[PDB]
Amino acid sequence: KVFGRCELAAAMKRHGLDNYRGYSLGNWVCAAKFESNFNTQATNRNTDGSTDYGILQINSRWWCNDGRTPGSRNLCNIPCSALLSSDITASVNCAKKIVSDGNGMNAWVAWRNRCKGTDVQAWIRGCRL
Ligand SMILES: [Cl-]
Ligand code: NA
């Protein structure tokens, strides 16, 4: 599923991401934009052999199981395929764990490089939220 911008904002808000670990909704929408372009089916192989999955490009080295990432963990206790569903529940649940791991949203390198410090409120402009 390719979410609309405001569509994703509404879903993320409903699932409790707005101000989660102090990160405003715009931060989460911005992260999703540059991680997946709002596409739940997005997958991208990393140089270390892990793969990033879904709307927030959650990585198989620590967070989900894909059966092909050697020596990796599954801290969200989910198959990585579950992060590709139209329903973003699993991705949000797992993202909450990731953002709580110590480095906040810096865990998403695209957030650090493209969202951090910017006018992230722009990402929820016009949305009836
Ligand atoms: Cl933080
Ligand atoms: Na894994």
Side-chain angles (χ1 to χ4, degrees), residues 26-71:
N27 280 286
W28 294 103
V29 178
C30 186
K33 171 70 177 179
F34 298 124
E35 291 293 354
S36 69
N37 204 16
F38 304 146
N39 190 344
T40 64
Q41 298 197 76
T43 62
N44 291 287
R45 176 86 83 160
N46 305 112
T47 60
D48 70 354
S50 70
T51 304
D52 294 334
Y53 296 85
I55 194 94
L56 285 166
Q57 290 290 276
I58 292 167
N59 191 258
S60 64
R61 185 179 60 169
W62 293 99
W63 306 107
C64 62
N65 178 58
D66 69 4
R68 67 169 199 192
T69 312

Short mmCIF file of all heavy atoms in Angstrom, two decimals, residues 26-71:
data_model
loop_
_atom_site.label_atom_id
_atom_site.label_comp_id
_atom_site.label_asym_id
_atom_site.label_seq_id
_atom_site.Cartn_x
_atom_site.Cartn_y
_atom_site.Cartn_z
N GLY A 26 5.23 15.00 12.73
CA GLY A 26 5.95 15.39 11.52
C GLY A 26 7.28 14.68 11.34
O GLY A 26 7.68 14.37 10.22
N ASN A 27 7.97 14.42 12.45
CA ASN A 27 9.21 13.64 12.41
C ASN A 27 9.01 12.24 11.85
O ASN A 27 9.81 11.76 11.05
CB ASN A 27 9.85 13.56 13.80
CG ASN A 27 10.61 14.80 14.16
OD1 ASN A 27 11.70 15.04 13.64
ND2 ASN A 27 10.05 15.60 15.05
N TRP A 28 7.93 11.59 12.29
CA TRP A 28 7.61 10.23 11.87
C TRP A 28 7.18 10.17 10.41
O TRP A 28 7.57 9.26 9.68
CB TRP A 28 6.53 9.64 12.77
CG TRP A 28 7.00 9.46 14.17
CD1 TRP A 28 6.71 10.24 15.25
CD2 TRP A 28 7.88 8.43 14.65
NE1 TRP A 28 7.35 9.77 16.37
CE2 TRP A 28 8.07 8.65 16.03
CE3 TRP A 28 8.52 7.34 14.04
CZ2 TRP A 28 8.88 7.83 16.81
CZ3 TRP A 28 9.32 6.52 14.82
CH2 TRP A 28 9.49 6.77 16.19
N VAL A 29 6.37 11.15 9.98
CA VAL A 29 5.95 11.23 8.59
C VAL A 29 7.14 11.51 7.67
O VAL A 29 7.28 10.89 6.62
CB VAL A 29 4.81 12.27 8.39
CG1 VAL A 29 4.42 12.38 6.93
CG2 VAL A 29 3.59 11.90 9.23
N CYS A 30 8.00 12.44 8.08
CA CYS A 30 9.22 12.74 7.34
C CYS A 30 10.11 11.50 7.20
O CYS A 30 10.60 11.20 6.11
CB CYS A 30 10.00 13.87 8.02
SG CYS A 30 11.44 14.44 7.11
N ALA A 31 10.30 10.78 8.30
CA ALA A 31 11.09 9.55 8.29
C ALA A 31 10.53 8.55 7.29
O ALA A 31 11.27 8.00 6.48
CB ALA A 31 11.17 8.95 9.67
N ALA A 32 9.22 8.32 7.34
CA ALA A 32 8.57 7.40 6.42
C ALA A 32 8.70 7.86 4.96
O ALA A 32 8.92 7.03 4.07
CB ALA A 32 7.11 7.21 6.79
N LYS A 33 8.58 9.16 4.72
CA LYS A 33 8.73 9.69 3.37
C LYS A 33 10.07 9.29 2.76
O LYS A 33 10.13 8.77 1.64
CB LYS A 33 8.58 11.21 3.35
CG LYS A 33 8.94 11.87 2.02
CD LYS A 33 7.92 11.56 0.94
CE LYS A 33 8.25 12.28 -0.35
NZ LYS A 33 7.25 11.96 -1.40
N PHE A 34 11.14 9.54 3.50
CA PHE A 34 12.48 9.31 2.95
C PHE A 34 12.97 7.87 3.10
O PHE A 34 13.87 7.45 2.37
CB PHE A 34 13.47 10.35 3.48
CG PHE A 34 13.12 11.75 3.06
CD1 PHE A 34 12.94 12.76 4.00
CD2 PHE A 34 12.95 12.07 1.71
CE1 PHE A 34 12.61 14.05 3.61
CE2 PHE A 34 12.61 13.36 1.31
CZ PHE A 34 12.45 14.35 2.26
N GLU A 35 12.38 7.11 4.02
CA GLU A 35 12.70 5.69 4.14
C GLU A 35 12.01 4.86 3.05
O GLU A 35 12.66 4.04 2.40
CB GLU A 35 12.34 5.15 5.52
CG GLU A 35 13.22 5.67 6.67
CD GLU A 35 14.67 5.19 6.62
OE1 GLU A 35 15.02 4.35 5.76
OE2 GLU A 35 15.46 5.67 7.46
N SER A 36 10.72 5.09 2.84
CA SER A 36 9.91 4.20 2.00
C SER A 36 9.07 4.89 0.93
O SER A 36 8.40 4.21 0.14
CB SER A 36 8.97 3.38 2.89
OG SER A 36 7.98 4.23 3.45
N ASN A 37 9.09 6.22 0.91
CA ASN A 37 8.16 7.01 0.10
C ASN A 37 6.70 6.62 0.35
O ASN A 37 5.87 6.61 -0.56
CB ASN A 37 8.51 6.94 -1.40
CG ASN A 37 7.98 8.14 -2.18
OD1 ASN A 37 7.59 9.16 -1.60
ND2 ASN A 37 7.95 8.02 -3.50
N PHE A 38 6.41 6.29 1.61
CA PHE A 38 5.07 5.93 2.08
C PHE A 38 4.56 4.58 1.55
O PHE A 38 3.37 4.28 1.65
CB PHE A 38 4.03 7.02 1.78
CG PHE A 38 4.37 8.39 2.32
CD1 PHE A 38 3.99 9.53 1.61
CD2 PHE A 38 4.99 8.56 3.55
CE1 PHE A 38 4.26 10.81 2.09
CE2 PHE A 38 5.26 9.84 4.05
CZ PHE A 38 4.90 10.96 3.31
N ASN A 39 5.47 3.75 1.03
CA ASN A 39 5.12 2.45 0.46
C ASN A 39 5.38 1.34 1.46
O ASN A 39 6.53 1.06 1.80
CB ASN A 39 5.94 2.23 -0.82
CG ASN A 39 5.49 1.02 -1.63
OD1 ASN A 39 4.77 0.15 -1.14
ND2 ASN A 39 5.92 0.96 -2.88
N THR A 40 4.31 0.69 1.94
CA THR A 40 4.45 -0.38 2.93
C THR A 40 5.25 -1.58 2.41
O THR A 40 5.80 -2.34 3.21
CB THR A 40 3.09 -0.90 3.45
OG1 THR A 40 2.36 -1.50 2.37
CG2 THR A 40 2.26 0.21 4.08
N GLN A 41 5.30 -1.75 1.09
CA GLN A 41 5.97 -2.91 0.51
C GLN A 41 7.46 -2.72 0.25
O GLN A 41 8.12 -3.65 -0.22
CB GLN A 41 5.26 -3.35 -0.78
CG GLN A 41 3.82 -3.78 -0.58
CD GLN A 41 3.30 -4.57 -1.76
OE1 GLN A 41 3.63 -5.74 -1.94
NE2 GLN A 41 2.48 -3.92 -2.57
N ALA A 42 7.98 -1.53 0.55
CA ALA A 42 9.39 -1.22 0.31
C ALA A 42 10.34 -2.18 1.04
O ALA A 42 10.19 -2.42 2.24
CB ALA A 42 9.69 0.22 0.71
N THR A 43 11.30 -2.72 0.29
CA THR A 43 12.39 -3.53 0.84
C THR A 43 13.70 -3.08 0.22
O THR A 43 13.77 -2.82 -0.98
CB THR A 43 12.22 -5.05 0.56
OG1 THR A 43 12.22 -5.29 -0.85
CG2 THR A 43 10.93 -5.58 1.17
N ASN A 44 14.74 -2.99 1.04
CA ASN A 44 16.06 -2.59 0.56
C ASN A 44 17.17 -3.35 1.27
O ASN A 44 17.26 -3.32 2.50
CB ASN A 44 16.25 -1.07 0.69
CG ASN A 44 15.36 -0.28 -0.27
OD1 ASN A 44 15.60 -0.24 -1.48
ND2 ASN A 44 14.33 0.36 0.27
N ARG A 45 17.98 -4.04 0.48
CA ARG A 45 19.11 -4.80 1.00
C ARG A 45 20.22 -3.86 1.44
O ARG A 45 20.55 -2.90 0.74
CB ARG A 45 19.62 -5.78 -0.07
CG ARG A 45 20.87 -6.57 0.31
CD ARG A 45 20.55 -7.84 1.08
NE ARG A 45 20.21 -8.94 0.18
CZ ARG A 45 20.27 -10.23 0.51
NH1 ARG A 45 20.65 -10.61 1.72
NH2 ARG A 45 19.93 -11.15 -0.38
N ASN A 46 20.78 -4.14 2.61
CA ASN A 46 21.92 -3.39 3.14
C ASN A 46 23.24 -4.08 2.83
O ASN A 46 23.26 -5.28 2.55
CB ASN A 46 21.77 -3.18 4.65
CG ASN A 46 20.46 -2.52 5.03
OD1 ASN A 46 19.60 -3.14 5.65
ND2 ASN A 46 20.30 -1.26 4.66
N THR A 47 24.33 -3.33 2.90
CA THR A 47 25.68 -3.85 2.61
C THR A 47 26.10 -4.98 3.55
O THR A 47 26.83 -5.89 3.15
CB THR A 47 26.75 -2.74 2.63
OG1 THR A 47 26.79 -2.13 3.93
CG2 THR A 47 26.45 -1.68 1.58
N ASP A 48 25.62 -4.94 4.79
CA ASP A 48 25.96 -5.96 5.79
C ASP A 48 25.18 -7.27 5.62
O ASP A 48 25.38 -8.22 6.38
CB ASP A 48 25.82 -5.41 7.22
CG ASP A 48 24.37 -5.17 7.63
OD1 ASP A 48 23.45 -5.30 6.80
OD2 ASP A 48 24.16 -4.83 8.82
N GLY A 49 24.29 -7.32 4.63
CA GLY A 49 23.51 -8.53 4.35
C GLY A 49 22.11 -8.51 4.93
O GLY A 49 21.27 -9.33 4.56
N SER A 50 21.86 -7.58 5.85
CA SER A 50 20.52 -7.37 6.38
C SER A 50 19.64 -6.69 5.33
O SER A 50 20.13 -6.24 4.29
CB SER A 50 20.57 -6.53 7.66
OG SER A 50 20.94 -5.20 7.39
N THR A 51 18.35 -6.63 5.61
CA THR A 51 17.39 -5.97 4.74
C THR A 51 16.50 -5.07 5.59
O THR A 51 16.20 -5.40 6.74
CB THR A 51 16.56 -7.00 3.93
OG1 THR A 51 17.45 -7.86 3.20
CG2 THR A 51 15.61 -6.33 2.95
N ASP A 52 16.11 -3.93 5.02
CA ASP A 52 15.15 -3.01 5.63
C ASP A 52 13.76 -3.26 5.05
O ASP A 52 13.62 -3.44 3.84
CB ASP A 52 15.55 -1.55 5.36
CG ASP A 52 16.85 -1.15 6.04
OD1 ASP A 52 17.21 -1.76 7.07
OD2 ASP A 52 17.50 -0.21 5.54
N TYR A 53 12.75 -3.24 5.91
CA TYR A 53 11.39 -3.62 5.53
C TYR A 53 10.35 -2.59 5.91
O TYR A 53 10.30 -2.12 7.05
CB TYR A 53 11.00 -4.94 6.20
CG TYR A 53 11.82 -6.12 5.75
CD1 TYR A 53 13.04 -6.41 6.36
CD2 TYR A 53 11.39 -6.95 4.72
CE1 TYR A 53 13.80 -7.50 5.96
CE2 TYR A 53 12.14 -8.04 4.31
CZ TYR A 53 13.35 -8.31 4.93
OH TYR A 53 14.10 -9.39 4.52
N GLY A 54 9.50 -2.26 4.94
CA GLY A 54 8.28 -1.54 5.20
C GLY A 54 8.37 -0.03 5.27
O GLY A 54 9.38 0.57 4.92
N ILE A 55 7.28 0.55 5.76
CA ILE A 55 7.05 1.99 5.82
C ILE A 55 8.18 2.75 6.53
O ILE A 55 8.49 3.89 6.16
CB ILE A 55 5.65 2.29 6.47
CG1 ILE A 55 5.20 3.73 6.25
CG2 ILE A 55 5.60 1.90 7.95
CD1 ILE A 55 4.32 3.91 5.05
N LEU A 56 8.79 2.13 7.53
CA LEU A 56 9.89 2.75 8.27
C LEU A 56 11.21 1.99 8.12
O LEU A 56 12.15 2.22 8.88
CB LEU A 56 9.52 2.93 9.74
CG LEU A 56 8.54 4.08 10.03
CD1 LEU A 56 7.98 3.97 11.44
CD2 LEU A 56 9.19 5.44 9.81
N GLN A 57 11.28 1.12 7.11
CA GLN A 57 12.52 0.44 6.74
C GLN A 57 13.24 -0.16 7.94
O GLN A 57 14.40 0.14 8.22
CB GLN A 57 13.43 1.39 5.95
CG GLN A 57 12.89 1.70 4.56
CD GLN A 57 12.97 0.50 3.64
OE1 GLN A 57 14.01 0.25 3.03
NE2 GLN A 57 11.88 -0.24 3.53
N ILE A 58 12.52 -1.02 8.65
CA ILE A 58 13.02 -1.67 9.85
C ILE A 58 13.94 -2.83 9.48
O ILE A 58 13.63 -3.64 8.61
CB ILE A 58 11.85 -2.09 10.76
CG1 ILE A 58 11.17 -0.84 11.33
CG2 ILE A 58 12.33 -3.02 11.88
CD1 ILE A 58 9.83 -1.08 11.99
N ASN A 59 15.08 -2.89 10.17
CA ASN A 59 16.20 -3.74 9.77
C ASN A 59 16.21 -5.13 10.40
O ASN A 59 15.89 -5.30 11.58
CB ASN A 59 17.51 -3.01 10.08
CG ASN A 59 18.72 -3.68 9.47
OD1 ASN A 59 19.46 -4.38 10.16
ND2 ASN A 59 18.92 -3.48 8.18
N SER A 60 16.60 -6.12 9.61
CA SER A 60 16.60 -7.52 10.02
C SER A 60 17.78 -7.94 10.90
O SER A 60 17.78 -9.04 11.44
CB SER A 60 16.53 -8.43 8.79
OG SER A 60 17.68 -8.28 7.98
N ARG A 61 18.78 -7.07 11.05
CA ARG A 61 19.94 -7.38 11.90
C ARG A 61 19.56 -7.48 13.38
O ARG A 61 20.11 -8.31 14.12
CB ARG A 61 21.08 -6.37 11.70
CG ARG A 61 22.37 -6.70 12.45
CD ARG A 61 23.46 -5.67 12.20
NE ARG A 61 23.07 -4.32 12.60
CZ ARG A 61 23.90 -3.28 12.68
NH1 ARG A 61 25.19 -3.42 12.39
NH2 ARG A 61 23.44 -2.10 13.06
N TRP A 62 18.61 -6.65 13.81
CA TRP A 62 18.22 -6.63 15.22
C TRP A 62 16.73 -6.84 15.48
O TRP A 62 16.35 -7.38 16.52
CB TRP A 62 18.66 -5.32 15.88
CG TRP A 62 20.15 -5.19 16.00
CD1 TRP A 62 20.98 -4.50 15.17
CD2 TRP A 62 20.99 -5.78 17.00
NE1 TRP A 62 22.28 -4.61 15.60
CE2 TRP A 62 22.31 -5.39 16.72
CE3 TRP A 62 20.74 -6.59 18.12
CZ2 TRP A 62 23.40 -5.79 17.51
CZ3 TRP A 62 21.82 -6.99 18.91
CH2 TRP A 62 23.13 -6.59 18.60
N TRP A 63 15.88 -6.42 14.54
CA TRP A 63 14.47 -6.17 14.88
C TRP A 63 13.44 -7.18 14.41
O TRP A 63 12.46 -7.42 15.11
CB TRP A 63 14.09 -4.74 14.47
CG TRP A 63 15.03 -3.74 15.05
CD1 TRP A 63 15.98 -3.03 14.39
CD2 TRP A 63 15.15 -3.36 16.43
NE1 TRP A 63 16.67 -2.22 15.25
CE2 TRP A 63 16.18 -2.41 16.52
CE3 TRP A 63 14.47 -3.74 17.60
CZ2 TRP A 63 16.56 -1.82 17.73
CZ3 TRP A 63 14.85 -3.15 18.81
CH2 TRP A 63 15.88 -2.20 18.86
N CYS A 64 13.64 -7.76 13.23
CA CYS A 64 12.70 -8.75 12.71
C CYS A 64 13.45 -9.94 12.13
O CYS A 64 14.64 -9.84 11.83
CB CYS A 64 11.78 -8.11 11.66
SG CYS A 64 12.60 -7.47 10.18
N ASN A 65 12.75 -11.06 11.97
CA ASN A 65 13.36 -12.23 11.36
C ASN A 65 13.01 -12.39 9.88
O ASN A 65 11.84 -12.45 9.51
CB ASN A 65 12.99 -13.52 12.09
CG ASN A 65 13.58 -14.75 11.41
OD1 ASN A 65 14.79 -14.85 11.25
ND2 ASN A 65 12.72 -15.66 10.98
N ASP A 66 14.05 -12.48 9.05
CA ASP A 66 13.86 -12.81 7.63
C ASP A 66 14.55 -14.11 7.21
O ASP A 66 14.49 -14.49 6.04
CB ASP A 66 14.23 -11.63 6.71
CG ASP A 66 15.73 -11.32 6.67
OD1 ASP A 66 16.55 -12.04 7.28
OD2 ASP A 66 16.08 -10.32 5.99
N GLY A 67 15.19 -14.78 8.17
CA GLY A 67 15.84 -16.07 7.93
C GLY A 67 17.09 -16.06 7.08
O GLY A 67 17.65 -17.12 6.79
N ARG A 68 17.55 -14.87 6.67
CA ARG A 68 18.74 -14.78 5.83
C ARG A 68 19.76 -13.74 6.31
O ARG A 68 20.62 -13.30 5.54
CB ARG A 68 18.35 -14.53 4.36
CG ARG A 68 17.71 -13.18 4.10
CD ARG A 68 17.60 -12.92 2.61
NE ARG A 68 17.42 -11.50 2.33
CZ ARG A 68 17.06 -11.01 1.15
NH1 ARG A 68 16.83 -11.82 0.12
NH2 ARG A 68 16.94 -9.70 0.99
N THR A 69 19.68 -13.37 7.58
CA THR A 69 20.59 -12.39 8.17
C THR A 69 21.38 -13.05 9.31
O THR A 69 20.89 -13.13 10.43
CB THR A 69 19.83 -11.14 8.67
OG1 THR A 69 18.93 -10.68 7.65
CG2 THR A 69 20.80 -10.03 9.02
N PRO A 70 22.60 -13.53 9.00
CA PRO A 70 23.43 -14.32 9.91
C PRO A 70 23.78 -13.61 11.22
O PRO A 70 24.20 -12.45 11.20
CB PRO A 70 24.71 -14.56 9.10
CG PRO A 70 24.29 -14.42 7.69
CD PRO A 70 23.27 -13.33 7.70
N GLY A 71 23.60 -14.31 12.34
CA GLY A 71 23.95 -13.80 13.66
C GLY A 71 23.06 -12.69 14.16
O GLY A 71 23.37 -12.02 15.15
#
